[PDB]
Amino acid sequence: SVVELIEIESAIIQVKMQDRTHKNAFSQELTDDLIQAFEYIRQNPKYKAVILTGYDNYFASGGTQEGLLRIQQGLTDDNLYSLALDCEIPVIAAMQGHGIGGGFVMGLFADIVILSRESVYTANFMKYGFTPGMGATFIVPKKLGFSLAQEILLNAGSYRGADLEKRGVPFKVLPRAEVLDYAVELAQELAEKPRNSLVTLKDHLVAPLRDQLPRVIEQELMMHEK
Amino acid sequence: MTHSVVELIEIESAIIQVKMQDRTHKNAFSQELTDDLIQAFEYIRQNPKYKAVILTGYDNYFASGGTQEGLLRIQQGLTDNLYSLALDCEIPVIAAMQGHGIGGGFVMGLFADIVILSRESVYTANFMKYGFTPGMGATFIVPKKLGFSLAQEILLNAGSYRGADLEKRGVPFKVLPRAEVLDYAVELAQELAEKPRNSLVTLKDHLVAPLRDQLPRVIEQELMMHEKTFHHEEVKSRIKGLYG
Amino acid sequence: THSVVELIEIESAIIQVKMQDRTHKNAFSQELTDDLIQAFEYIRQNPKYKAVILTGYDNYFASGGTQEGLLRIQQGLTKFTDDNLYSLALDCEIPVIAAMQGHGIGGGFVMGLFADIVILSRESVYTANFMKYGFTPGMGATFIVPKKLGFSLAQEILLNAGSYRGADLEKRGVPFKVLPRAEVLDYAVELAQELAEKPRNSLVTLKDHLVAPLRDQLPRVIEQELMMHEKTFHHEEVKSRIKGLYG
């Protein structure tokens, strides 16, 4: 056996993956032993928590080279904001400078957004008295999370990239001077993939956005008009 | 690009840079920037030699949104399933990733109710490095756990991140030195074990019902992506050449 | 009933609802429950405010069910939907800022989470501590915690019922602003002033649109939480935990 089961205290079960030969890749052995380990847990209602762990410097390695090869062989005022979104291939919004209002929102529709620490970012629609447009009300909560989006959108405040970074955004935030160079490097790493794989994957990741954006725009239009 | 407000630059053969440079309007949406941006993206759509686009502004301006004039006009009204083992387990599961988590092995741990990473270890959803699309429910569990935006980069680029890099990017997982990871998992597990089993299972069932309900449709969509991407000679050479 | 909530009109368009049941440290006494409802009804009947600031006193934001209150649910005399405090900030037409200058415990933490803006104090303690008493989270915690803090952190928060300082949450990466306690209310006031720069109708229209999925989805989750309370609340060992661990 390549999975060891260790009880800790009364009701804790540790599942320790130890396929040293394969560094916890999914050999036949690790696969079978993992399934049996979870089946054993399922048959035992003493346990209240499971610790799944690896050994040494390996948690789990994924498909072995031969297992991947087996699969390979078969054994196994209404448009511009969404330009990035409708683009077939990945778009990096390298916002080396300020992104204000619809300019910010336009960039938020890119697959990868990079900010600059010194620049100003704002969904400032409500500063003019208007409810937000250009799909702001959809793309802000979707990229920045529901809670930060309520603040951004209700208040239309201005944040430096450095503020957003301290608030916890998922975007890479860099000094202005480094923004482009980081984007070109990331673009180079992206271009190492087959173009069909990039498009196939982006189509699947952004389908709910492409599907739901039109109705959000309609609701945003109805908010104007009131 | 016509109005001369958007410059296209090819970087290498497969990367196009769309640079917005309406200096007069500081990259606000003037007529020219609008038409030039639409023309730039149409150019991209009709030139599928590119694999990535970089959209950028000039100097201190990315894009300034509606013009002041435009906005005033409006105001005025003139215009075997290894991957789901942790998810199907009735009790809370802690993935103590004291070591590297690579591809399906990373994804398998992300289905746990609590994930802990090591600072020193490397984590990657590396499917796309081999040319094929992510499987094992990655395109569901990675955005579910790490948020839509970070998951885009992780999945599309198949990058390697130390636990310390993810901790800097803002993950909700606890990240510790390798040598503390298991001790902390055991302390957490002992705290969970203070609860009645029935309350733990009833609550897990409720918290993860929408994952158990949705995962099978996502797996189906990932299979559909694998049919389109897995069975190309290019995938076989990347597996032979780039593995470990 | 009748002086455990103070209402202060802080400027022409800003109202502060301050909870100050000192006897119960802002646990949900009958008096606190009644005054909070009354204060939100007053805001609903006077449609001139643009922002509400909900805050506590000294070191307490809100402490959740009183011990007696919890034991009545345990006995099956009541259920947590009997008085609906949990959703006051969500049902409010205008933006609500939860200025949590002090501790936020159980139903008191969750009630604050329904506000449109949440500010935490670094040195205060926050916890969805339901499970520590052996029963499942109610007050809509299983909806609002994952909504505001993200699926992954909510798992831990809800399952383990652990206590976090504001500093701990800040470190774990929450989208809420976390401040020294002494700065929390002034910062709430400043943000309320920036909110009060917008037209009231615009703020109401936008909040209605932003919180519509929450107002639509909450009632089904509350029903599921009532079902979990049916399976978990009325055990003897819950009474033992309430009696043994409260405080």
Author numbering:
A (entry chain C): 4 to 79, 83 to 232
B (entry chain A): 1 to 79, 84 to 248
C (entry chain B): 2 to 248
Sentences from the paper on this structure:
Two crystal structures of PksI were elucidated; the first to 1.93 Å resolution using a crystal cryoprotected in glycerol (PksI_GOL), and the second to 2.1 Å using a crystal cryoprotected using ethylene glycol (PksI_EG). Both structures describe an asymmetric unit comprised of three protein chains arranged in the form of a trimer. The final model of PksI_EG comprises residues 1–248 of chain A, residues 2–248 of chain B, and residues 4–232 of chain C, 417 water molecules, 4 molecules of ethylene glycol and 2 molecules of glycerol. In the PksI_EG structure all the active sites adopt the “closed” ground state conformation.
In this study we present a structural and functional description of the bacillaene synthase β-branching enzymes PksH and PksI. Akin to PksH, PksI adopts a characteristic CS fold, with a ββα core, that comprises two approximately perpendicular -sheets surrounded by -helices.
